[PDB]
Amino acid sequence: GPSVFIFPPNIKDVLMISLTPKVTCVVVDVSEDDPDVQISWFVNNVEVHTAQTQTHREDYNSTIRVVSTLPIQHQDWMSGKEFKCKVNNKDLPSPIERTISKIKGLVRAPQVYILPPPAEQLSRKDVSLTCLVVGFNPGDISVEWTSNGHTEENYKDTAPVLDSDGSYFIYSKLNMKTSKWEKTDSFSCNVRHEGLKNYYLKKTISRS
Amino acid sequence: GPSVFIFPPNIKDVLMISLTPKVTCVVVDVSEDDPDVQISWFVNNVEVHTAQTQTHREDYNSTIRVVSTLPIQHQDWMSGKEFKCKVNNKDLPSPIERTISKIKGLVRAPQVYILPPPAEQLSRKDVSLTCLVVGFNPGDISVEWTSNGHTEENYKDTAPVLDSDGSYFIYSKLNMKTSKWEKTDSFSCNVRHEGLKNYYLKKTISRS
Ligand SMILES: *[C@@H]1O[C@H](CO[C@@H]2O[C@@H](C)[C@@H](O)[C@@H](O)[C@@H]2O)[C@@H](O[C@@H]2O[C@H](CO)[C@@H](O[C@H]3O[C@H](CO[C@H]4O[C@H](CO)[C@@H](O)[C@H](O)[C@@H]4O[C@@H]4O[C@H](CO)[C@@H](O[C@@H]5O[C@H](CO)[C@H](O)[C@H](O)[C@H]5O)[C@H](O)[C@H]4NC(C)=O)[C@@H](O)[C@H](O[C@H]4O[C@H](CO)[C@@H](O)[C@H](O)[C@@H]4O[C@@H]4O[C@H](CO)[C@@H](O)[C@H](O)[C@H]4NC(C)=O)[C@@H]3O)[C@H](O)[C@H]2NC(C)=O)[C@H](O)[C@H]1NC(C)=O
Ligand SMILES: *[C@@H]1O[C@H](CO[C@@H]2O[C@@H](C)[C@@H](O)[C@@H](O)[C@@H]2O)[C@@H](O[C@@H]2O[C@H](CO)[C@@H](O[C@H]3O[C@H](CO[C@H]4O[C@H](CO)[C@@H](O)[C@H](O)[C@@H]4O[C@@H]4O[C@H](CO)[C@@H](O[C@@H]5O[C@H](CO)[C@H](O)[C@H](O)[C@H]5O)[C@H](O)[C@H]4NC(C)=O)[C@@H](O)[C@H](O[C@H]4O[C@H](CO)[C@@H](O)[C@H](O)[C@@H]4O[C@@H]4O[C@H](CO)[C@@H](O)[C@H](O)[C@H]4NC(C)=O)[C@@H]3O)[C@H](O)[C@H]2NC(C)=O)[C@H](O)[C@H]1NC(C)=O
């Protein structure tokens, strides 16, 4: 029959109070004859009624998926409360249950560094700024870029990578125009991580 | 029953004529009661008899794993010959075949940069040298470090990461004592890739 998977909120949504973190329950391979799925939600075994549930046609392989996202309180995630979805359908003998909560573990704040472009790039039209975020636990982190205050979108980062000392690091590569590098005052690597004071740390660099 | 997985040689073994690349077939979930397995190997459907096979007791879940590695010629892998293992066992109705060969893809040679430590890190007891390798296809690459000729093993790299332009990049971080950053004359990032001349490029950095 159908399978069910549960997912934690995005770490950025958890650490940014103006955003809405959500726990997600996904019912995969729902039968088309039988698309009625009831998904109910529990926070520490207390039922809640705020989840938004949608059916999606998966055109990759012509299947159906039902996705339920429960909006949650940030502090409830951080303080270790259990979120649980119960899925009922006809093709299911008994209801299938999934539970998730935040893993209580080692917390270690990252160091954040910005590396200027390599010298070899300074004669080209485009340069790469590198944000190196090092020594954090756990491995969940948001890393974004701005120039002065404006959001920069033309970056990619790596997976968090577990180092030999048991902590993680990540690289983020921002490509911008050498002219922009020359004219713009400042570029900022903005890091959200639970070990940081206020969950937030900005590092800024300028061309000299 | 059991299943069979086939794995390619490691890119470094492929690109260094002095090393021995191997195609590997792994049989998982062979029963403790029937650990015997028959395995044959074919290079372009000619049987070869050079494979090394070891059986492992997987005490974790009381199963058996058989790993067979065929040593292969570099040119045979690079030129796209088909490597095939056929596996039989009591608990398999008919023999399982797995095949593998090198994909004929785009080959794009990367640029290699070495970045010095970020300025804010030079106070510490250890500094990080960053090797940034940008714009390669396919995404198989070997990145290693030397100080002059001598191997420097205290490094971790990211996965290759697929960029915006459909090429890959990768970061490699070598951590070193700040004292060696000031004493040692040179550190080298050594990149082996299909698209590089002689499959090898060395980039070198010193403190200035
Ligand atoms: C038909 O096709 C569909 C679609 O297939 C996919 O899409 C196409 C286009 C191609 O890319 C396919 O190759 C794709 O696969 C098939 O559906 C898929 O079915 C799989 C089942 O066979 C199922 O498998 C794995 O799922 C998770 C990983 O899921 C994430 O990554 C997948 C990519 O690998 C994605 O497909 C998923 O979408 C999912 O991605 C995450 O999604 C969440 C929720 O949307 C999202 O979080 C939310 O994001 C919001 C913003 O977008 C916001 O932030 C919200 O607040 C937030 O909540 C994530 O951000 C997003 N991340 C990414 C990177 O995309 C695996 O975990 C799972 O493994 C577990 O189960 C197997 C057993 O089956 C075990 O072997 C395995 O070890 C795991 O077991 C678990 O182990 C841990 C620790 O070991 C334990 O703690 C757990 O208890 C234990 N759990 C269990 C249950 O055992 C699966 O391997 C895919 O999710 C699913 N995809 C979708 C989209 O539904 C379908 O199968 C096909 N049908 C047929 C008949 O063939
Ligand atoms: C009982 O337990 C065992 C052990 O379980 C593990 O250990 C315990 C303690 C726990 O930690 C568990 O969580 C662990 O799982 C279970 O065995 C496991 O069974 C899995 C299947 O049930 C099997 O699954 C995946 O295997 C490969 C990945 O394998 C590599 O990565 C793993 C994770 O890193 C490693 O652990 C593996 O050992 C393996 O590592 C690779 O090993 C090769 C071979 O040695 C090595 O290459 C050689 O290396 C040499 C140097 O040492 C030298 O360089 C040689 O030249 C070189 O050849 C590699 O270096 C190394 N690689 C890496 C990355 O580390 C997955 O690829 C595979 O995925 C496929 O299957 C599913 C479904 O088909 C798909 O989602 C997926 O896309 C793949 O499908 C493929 O898709 C393509 C197209 O996209 C098709 O063309 C393919 O044909 C298609 N394949 C098929 C078959 O259709 C599996 O998901 C685990 O490997 C295996 N673990 C071990 C250690 O054997 C067992 O299941 C349990 N039994 C139970 C519970 O009943």
Residue numbers in the entry:
A (entry chain B), B (entry chain A): 237 to 444
What does the paper say about this structure?
To gain mechanistic insights into the molecular process behind these interactions, we attempted to observe the dynamic interactions of an anti-GM1 monoclonal autoantibody, GB2. This autoantibody was generated by immunization of mice with GM1-like lipo-oligosaccharide purified from a C. jejuni strain isolated from a patient with Guillain–Barré syndrome. Our study visualized antigen-dependent assembly of the GB2 antibodies on model membranes, giving rise to hexameric ring structures, which particularly interacted with C1q.
We solved the crystal structures of the Fc fragment of GB2 and that of the same IgG isotype in the absence or presence of the B domain of protein A, respectively. Intriguingly, the mouse anti-GM1 IgG2b(κ) antibody GB2, in which positions 345, 430, and 440 are occupied by alanine, glutamic acid, and threonine, respectively, were highly preorganized into the hexameric ring on the antigenic membrane formation without artificial mutations. In the wild-type IgG2b, the hexameric ring formation occurred exclusively on the membranes containing specific antigenic molecules and did not occur in solution. This ordering process is entropically unfavorable; therefore, it is promoted selectively under on-membrane conditions, where diffusion of IgG molecules is considerably restricted.
